[PDB]
Amino acid sequence: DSELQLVEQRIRSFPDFPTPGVVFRDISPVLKDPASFRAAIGLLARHLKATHGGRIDYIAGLDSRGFLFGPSLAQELGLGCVLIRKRGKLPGPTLWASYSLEFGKAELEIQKDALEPGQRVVVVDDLLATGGTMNAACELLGRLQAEVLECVSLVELTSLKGREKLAPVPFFSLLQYE
Amino acid sequence: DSELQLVEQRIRSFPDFPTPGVVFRDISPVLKDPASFRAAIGLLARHLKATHGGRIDYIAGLDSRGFLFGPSLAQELGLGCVLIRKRGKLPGPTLWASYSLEFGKAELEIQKDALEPGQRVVVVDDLLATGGTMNAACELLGRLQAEVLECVSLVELTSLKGREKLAPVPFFSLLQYE
Ligand SMILES: Nc1ncnc2c1ncn2[C@@H]1O[C@H](COP(=O)(O)O)[C@@H](O)[C@H]1O
Ligand SMILES: Nc1ncnc2c1ncn2[C@@H]1O[C@H](COP(=O)(O)O)[C@@H](O)[C@H]1O
Ligand SMILES: [Mg+2]
Numbered sequence A, B: 001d002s003e004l005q006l007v008e009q010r011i012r013s014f015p016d017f018p019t020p021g022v023v024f025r026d027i028s029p030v031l032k033d034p035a036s037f038r039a040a041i042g043l044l045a046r047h048l049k050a051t052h053g054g055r056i057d058y059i060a061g062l063d064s065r066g067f068l069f070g071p072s073l074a075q076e077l078g079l080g081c082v083l084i085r086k087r088g089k090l091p092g093p094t095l096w097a098s099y100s101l102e103f104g105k106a107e108l109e110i111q112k113d114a115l116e117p118g119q120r121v122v123v124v125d126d127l128l129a130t131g132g133t134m135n136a137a138c139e140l141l142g143r144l145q146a147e148v149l150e151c152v153s154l155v156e157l158t159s160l161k162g163r164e165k166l167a168p169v170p171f172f173s174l175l176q177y178e
Helices: A002-008 A028-032 A034-052 A070-077 A132-143 A162-166 B002-008 B028-032 B034-052 B070-077 B132-143 B162-166
Strands: A012-015 A023-026 A058-062 A080-086 A094-097 A108-111 A120-128 A147-157 A171-177 B012-015 B023-026 B058-062 B080-086 B094-101 B104-111 B120-128 B147-157 B171-177
Touching: A002 A034, A002 A171, A028 A034, A028 B070, A028 B080, A034 A070, A034 A120, A034 A147, A034 A171, A034 B070, A034 B080, A058 A070, A058 A132, A070 A080, A070 B028, A070 B034, A070 B070, A080 A132, A080 B028, A080 B034, A094 A132, A108 A132, A120 A132, A120 A162, A132 A147, A132 A162, A147 A162, A162 A171, B002 B034, B002 B171, B028 B034, B034 B070, B034 B120, B034 B147, B034 B171, B058 B070, B058 B132, B070 B080, B080 B132, B094 B132, B104 B132, B120 B132, B120 B162, B132 B147, B132 B162, B147 B162, B162 B171
Parallel strands: A058 A080, A058 A120, A120 A147, A147 A171, B058 B080, B058 B120, B120 B147, B147 B171
Antiparallel strands: A012 A023, A080 A108, A094 A108, B012 B023, B080 B104, B094 B104
16 A cells, blocks of 8 residues: 555654663654655545444544644544643643553543533544553543544554553554554 | 634633633634634635745644644645654754743754755744744754744734744734733
8 A cells, every 4th residue: 555655654763762662653754744644644534434434523632643633634534623631731620531651650631521422532643552541531531421433543562552451442553563 | 704703713711721810722622613623724824825925845833732733734735744842752863942931941842854954934833922932943943944934823912922022033823812
């Protein structure tokens, strides 16, 4: 698939960033090459329409690199985008959820009025690793009584088993690395 | 302008967040309403094409809320988007710049290969307040020997004199509040 190739050739890997042991996958070149960015959005949108038909109400983009894909994906689908943020950034009543990151803990947050009960959402981030971030996003959406139809990313790190962590919520990635 | 009205009517204002006396301008409803988001991007793109013609090489989006608008704006103009991030987030060789934020300092950072000398860029963020954030972005881009043609935002808080801070770099906002 030549479209998928346009995305894969624009991921660059950095060993031992930001700390020894981690291989950082940088999506920055995807954003800088408009053909690559369009390809990524199109592949995601095609997968989602093929899997869900007209059942998706909103895209939810995750702070911060998910913000890079969420609005464009939503627009391609004719949908709105809701935001899930790092704690402390959103005004009005919120809910929050932790999930260890690094050697400690961190929290995502959503506005209590971001969605109505029963609304169906697809969550997008750039990369799925342990699944902690996406899992916290699903927890928050679930607490608003929203139905998470699927989580998607450009990149999945399969040895970290984030897919199993999200089960039974379906997951889809464009590219997989160990 | 009916398009501009579509954006204006989706800015929600929260008094006393995060501190008493400040009014937080929340762009979330713009993202959530696909017609509003499309109107915002179209208004920005129309302004930039009319102002700069073919001079723009790249859009630069600012972490984090600028990430919500940068890629869509770039796609609308047929351009790539480069990223300016909170320090410590980007791999590889970088430049960073401090600036004042609230009661302390913060730092932005850009990859040294984000742009080549002579390339022309427009910076986008959701909102211009003091201008410290946009000013640091301009400094970083200048240090790569890039030319900043303009900075743009959805919202500008005119009493904080951000425009004046950025001068002589031109600036444009869709909406203005005191
Ligand atoms: N190796 C990596 N390269 C780039 N980003 C990563 C990497 N591991 C984790 N992330 C980021 O951290 C979050 C995923 O981590 P996790 O919560 O473990 O699934 C996403 O928001 C990613 O942007
Ligand atoms: N009243 C406000 N409402 C919403 N966001 C704000 C407000 N003031 C500052 N910001 C955010 O902080 C940054 C601009 O601050 P400044 O550097 O003071 O121009 C932008 O990235 C804005 O998103
Ligand atoms: Mg992230």
